[PDB]
From TrEMBL:
Role description: Catalyzes the hydrolysis of ATP coupled with the transport of calcium.
Lineage of the species this protein comes from: Eukaryota, Metazoa, Chordata, Craniata, Vertebrata
Parts of the chain that traverse the membrane: 60-78, 84-107, 260-280, 292-321, 760-781, 833-857, 931-950
Record protein name field: Calcium-transporting ATPase
Membrane topology (UniProt): Multi-pass membrane protein
Alphabetized InterPro entries for the sequence: ATPase_P-typ_cation-transptr_C, ATPase_P-typ_cation-transptr_N, ATPase_P-typ_cyto_dom_N, ATPase_P-typ_P_site, ATPase_P-typ_TM_dom_sf, ATPase_P-typ_transduc_dom_A_sf, ATPase_P-type_domA, HAD-like_sf
Span of domain Cation-transporting P-type ATPase N-terminal: 3-77
Record's catalysed reaction(s): Ca(2+)(in) + ATP + H2O = Ca(2+)(out) + ADP + phosphate + H(+)
Matching NCBIfam families: ATPase-IIA1_Ca, ATPase_P-type
Cofactor(s) recorded in Swiss-Prot or TrEMBL: Mg(2+)
Organism whose genome encodes this protein: Oryctolagus cuniculus
Chief localisation class: endoplasmic reticulum
């Protein structure tokens, strides 16, 4: 039964065939449980460790590597020798990286925590129900409650289900519906039915929501809905039904996996199509098996030299590093893949109160009527200084400090601001500053009366903690607070019934002090007060009031106006039903307008600036606020979202206006809007969908499970640090300070970080190019392998990893924020860039094989056989080219490999310097620009040597220390890699910039 709030308490009992005095019967319980199921949100997929481990092998590149370990394993088995201490190293090393890879992946999952499982935090274990099979109340597990159950809740209880309140046993019932919104301000529930069947939760004043808490009172009610049919349950379904796509980088990286694979295969087929000459060879003779071991040997190397094995670690270390860096700037990112996303943010939808504004209220002005006399009318406008909650400030008329007590209208004005208020003050000695107790807008009033002191009461004597509520405590003693009629959006005001203090046997003298939004309150006034006198409200004097109100809340003041009035002749205390809020507007009528107070909720000092950075960065800003349309726009012009004098007729909507627009038109309104005022529950989410249909990377703020759906949908869900824990777990980032600027600062941090990733990404991949050139080269030239898997891996994970990581510290461009949001579609490498790395590739691959050949030829230590070409044979089954000589295993000399490897390592350290800037020369941007890079190179070289002398290692890799001549050769063949790219960059700068 979903519409319970709109039905009568009787209808809800009838509907379920249950008696309030006895409850459900064991039969009914059985059937109700059978039909609606247990009261609890469904479980999450029990992702088993085993399945989780298997997932660590879903990727295509890992399969290849796994496959490669397989061929490696067999090769290191179907081989004939004795060196079993350096034969299985390769296969075992591959398997071992896949293990750490799988091990790491599973570590994440165990620590990761989704928002749906966060919602189960709000469901209580037990509930208290009344069921026929017993007399007294009985407590059962909340999962056993069912729709129709008669339940019982009391102060402190966590509501077990969505409940239609039948009877309030205590004086009044109060609920903390905080988890839905965040504003712990308890609200008063009733039992009368709410008419509108489509009323949003905030107005279902006769309902209790599963997950909320009783702040005060005791109540009996009937269960309307349970499980996923409750409010939070329907919020759990929206979230679950929401799939968050892969980040631009993740998609672009996954696409790379496909191509890289399609290349690794084509290069293998390519190595085949080249030796097709073997078909034309006599079947007899030649070790066929030695022909297959040859291919599979290169297949392994080919694949291992194609995969950027260390890319994942480098990306992570960079993202992890940047994140701590963002956290120092108040941005707490929960998702590493988000850091990249944040950079492409094209639209930021932010709540105003507390994020764009400080949510530190303060009354700045107030006006009462000076005099009425026919068509002539004059008001008395005042100003108040001080903007803290502290009672320090002053009132001034035309800047001249006046004294409140000298004006009667201000005496009463103050009486209303004090008596018609549920908030107070308190001096926090610990912090040394006065803090608010209750609501912001109301404490602003408690503070106001203190600076006003309409009774010139001696307060300067009083301490500090005592000074807090001095003038208030005074006004209170003057009036007894019989009771108070709560605020409700229908009427938009609240009142308090007060009687005099010094009264024994009297039946006259009572008063009602009304407070609320101007339009409604003023429309119910037939009287305007002029000091102590009272005169009728007339057409003109009403314009003046409304006129000013409009000037204060719409003008450069952007003030929230509150009208204050009192009902002189309030209906008799007995003729009033304090049970039907529906009767409150009636009870608050035929009032007398006293005055108005305009309060300000100030823009964070850093917002004005931050909004400009966005404009520079092509990032749109949409303010979502609760202010009426007029003041919403006013505040927009004030912070820079709107031009002070520009048209916005079609860029600011109220939830109402928006709803009326037909689907097609809303989608439109969202592409050009910057202001949404009085937004409905389903709007942040609908605003996010529309924004995505235009491919906008969207950021959306929020808190409370209310916003969790929108948070989850938006690409960058942003939660307040002070927000609920569900809003947090449902978001990409959390604002430690709740400040809008923290968002912008983080978006700029994401642009810096993504630029630096493009660098180490291209660096590493480009490096794999030279490797596949080397391997493919050595093959299509029948040369002795220049480099081997065990080695290639060390370079891709260690040698190249250190530089790649240091590249993330590359200093950011000054124009980082003066350029528009990066397009999600923008490819990493393309066009000229491809040619560049393709060339840089060729050279690196050529240079490695050549460094090997140089030793095998124009070198001493090795055969001086120039143009001898080992291409010819490698079986030595004839030993023709070397008649006189019993030697053929020099083809495996450790020197040639060592020459090529030192070339790779040294060339790549030089390429780490060519990566300091995409197109700027080393002349313009020096190497020392990034000190971390230098350090990394020294470290990587020290490691290279490390494997060259520490015995266990030089054998594992099959290397031998180089001669100063040989090393001096590596430098000669490496160093030129710089001029090469320097030449390529030059071309890019001078013949492409258009
Ligand atoms: Na999200």
């Amino acid at each position: 039964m979903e519409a319970a709030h709109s039905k009568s308490t009787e209808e809800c009992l009838a509907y379920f065939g249950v008696s309030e005095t006895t409850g459900l019967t064991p039969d009914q319980v059985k059937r109700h449980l059978e039909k609606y199921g247990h009261n609890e949100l469904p479980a999450e997929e029990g992702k088993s460790l085993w399945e989780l481990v298997i997932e660590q092998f879903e990727d295509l590149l890992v399969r290849i590597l796994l496959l490669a370990a397989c061929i490696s394993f067999v090769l290191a088995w179907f081989e004939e020798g004795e060196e079993t201490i350096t034969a299985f190293v390769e296969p075992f090393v591959i398997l071992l990286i896949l293990i750490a890879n799988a091990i790491v992946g599973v570590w994440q999952e165990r620590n990761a925590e989704n928002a749906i499982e966060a919602l189960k935090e709000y469901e209580p274990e037990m509930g208290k129900v009344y069921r026929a099979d017993r007399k007294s109340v009985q407590r059962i597990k909340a999962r056993d409650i069912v729709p129709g159950d008669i339940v019982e809740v009391a102060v402190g209880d966590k509501v077990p289900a969505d409940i239609r309140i039948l009877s309030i046993k205590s004086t009044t019932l109060r609920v903390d519906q905080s988890i839905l919104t965040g504003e712990s301000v308890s609200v008063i529930k009733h039992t009368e039915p709410v008419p509108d069947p489509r009323a949003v939760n905030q107005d279902k004043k006769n309902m209790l929501f599963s997950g909320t808490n009783i702040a005060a009172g005791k109540a009996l009610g009937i269960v309307a809905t349970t499980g996923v049919s409750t409010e939070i349950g329907k919020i759990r379904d929206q979230m679950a039904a929401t799939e968050q796509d892969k980040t631009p980088l993740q998609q672009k990286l996954d696409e790379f996996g496909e191509q890289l694979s399609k290349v690794i295969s084509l290069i293998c087929v390519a190595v085949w199509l080249i030796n097709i000459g073997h078909f034309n060879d006599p079947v007899h003779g030649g070790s066929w098996i030695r022909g297959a071991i040859y291919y599979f040997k290169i297949a392994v190397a080919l694949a291992v030299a194609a995969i950027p094995e260390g890319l994942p670690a480098v990306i992570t270390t960079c993202l992890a590093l940047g994140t701590r860096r963002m956290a120092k700037k108040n941005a707490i990112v929960r998702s590493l893949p988000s850091v990249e996303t944040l950079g492409c943010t094209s639209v930021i939808c932010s709540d105003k109160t507390g994020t764009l504004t400080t949510n530190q209220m303060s009354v700045c002005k107030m006006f009462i009527i000076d005099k009425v006399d026919g068509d002539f009318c004059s008001l008395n406008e005042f100003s108040i200084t001080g903007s803290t909650y502290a009672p320090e400030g002053e009132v001034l008329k035309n800047d001249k400090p006046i004294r409140s007590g000298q004006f009667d209208g201000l005496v009463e004005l103050a009486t209303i601001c004090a008596l018609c208020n549920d908030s107070s003050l308190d001096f926090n000695e610990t912090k040394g500053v006065y803090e608010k107790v209750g609501e912001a807008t109301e404490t602003a009033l408690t503070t106001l009366v203190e600076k006003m002191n309409v009774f010139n009461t001696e307060v300067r004597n009083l301490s500090k903690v005592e000074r807090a509520n001095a003038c208030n405590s005074v006004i209170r003693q003057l009036m007894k607070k019989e009771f108070t009629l709560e605020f409700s959006r229908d009427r938009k005001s609240m009142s308090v019934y007060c009687s005099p203090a010094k009264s024994s046997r009297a039946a006259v003298g009572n008063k009602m002090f009304v407070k609320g939004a101007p339009e409604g309150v003023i429309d119910r006034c037939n009287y305007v007060r002029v000091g102590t006198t009272r005169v009728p409200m007339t057409g003109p004097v009403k314009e003046k009031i409304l006129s000013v109100i409009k000037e204060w809340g719409t003008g450069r003041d952007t003030l929230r106006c509150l009208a204050l009035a009192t009902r002189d002749t309030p209906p008799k205390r007995e003729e009033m039903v304090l049970d039907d809020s529906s009767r409150f507007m009636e009870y608050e009528t035929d009032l007398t307008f006293v005055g108005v107070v305009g309060m300000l909720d100030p823009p964070r000092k850093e917002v004005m600036g931050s909004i400009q950075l966005c404009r520079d960065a092509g990032i749109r800003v949409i303010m979502i606020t609760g202010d009426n349309k007029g003041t919403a726009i006013a505040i927009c012009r004030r912070i820079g979202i709107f031009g002070e004098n520009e048209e916005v007729a079609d860029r600011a909507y109220t939830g109402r206006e928006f709803d009326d627009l037909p689907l097609a038109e809303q989608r439109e309104a969202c592409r050009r809007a910057c202001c949404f005022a009085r937004v409905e529950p389903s709007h942040k989410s609908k605003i996010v969908e529309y924004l995505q249909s235009y491919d906008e990377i969207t950021a959306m703020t929020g808190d409370g499970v209310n916003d969790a759906p929108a948070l989850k949908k938006a690409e960058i869900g942003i939660a307040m640090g002070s927000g609920t824990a569900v809003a947090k777990t449902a978001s990409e980032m959390v604002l430690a300070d709740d400040n809008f600027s923290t968002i912008v600062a983080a978006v700029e941090e994401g642009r810096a970080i993504y630029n630096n990733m493009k660098q180490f990404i291209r660096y590493l991949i480009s490096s794999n190019v030279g490797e596949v050139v080397c391997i493919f080269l050595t093959a299509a030239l029948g040369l002795p392998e220049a480099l081997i898997p065990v080695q290639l891996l060390w370079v891709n994970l260690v040698t190249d990893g250190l530089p790649a990581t240091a590249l993330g510290f590359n200093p950011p461009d000054l124009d980082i924020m003066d350029r528009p949001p990066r397009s999600p579609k923008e490819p990493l490498i393309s066009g000229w860039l491809f040619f560049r790395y393709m060339a840089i590739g060729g050279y690196v691959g050529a240079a490695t094989v050549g460094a090997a050949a140089w030793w095998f030829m124009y070198a001493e230590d090795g055969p001086g056989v120039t143009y001898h070409q080992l291409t010819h044979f490698m079986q030595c089954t004839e030993d023709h080219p070397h008649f006189e000589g019993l030697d053929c295993e020099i083809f495996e000399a450790p020197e040639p490999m060592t020459m090529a490897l030192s070339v790779l390592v040294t060339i790549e350290m030089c390429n780490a310097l060519n990566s300091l800037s995409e197109n700027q020369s080393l002349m313009r941007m020096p190497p020392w620009v990034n000190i971390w890079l230098l350090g990394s190179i020294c470290l990587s070289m020290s490691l290279h040597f490390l494997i060259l002398y520490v015995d266990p290692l030089p054998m594992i890799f099959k290397l031998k220390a180089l001669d100063l001549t040989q090393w001096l050769m590596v430098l000669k063949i490496s160093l030129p890699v710089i001029g090469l790219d320097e030449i390529l960059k030059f071309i890019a700068r001078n013949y492409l910039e258009g």
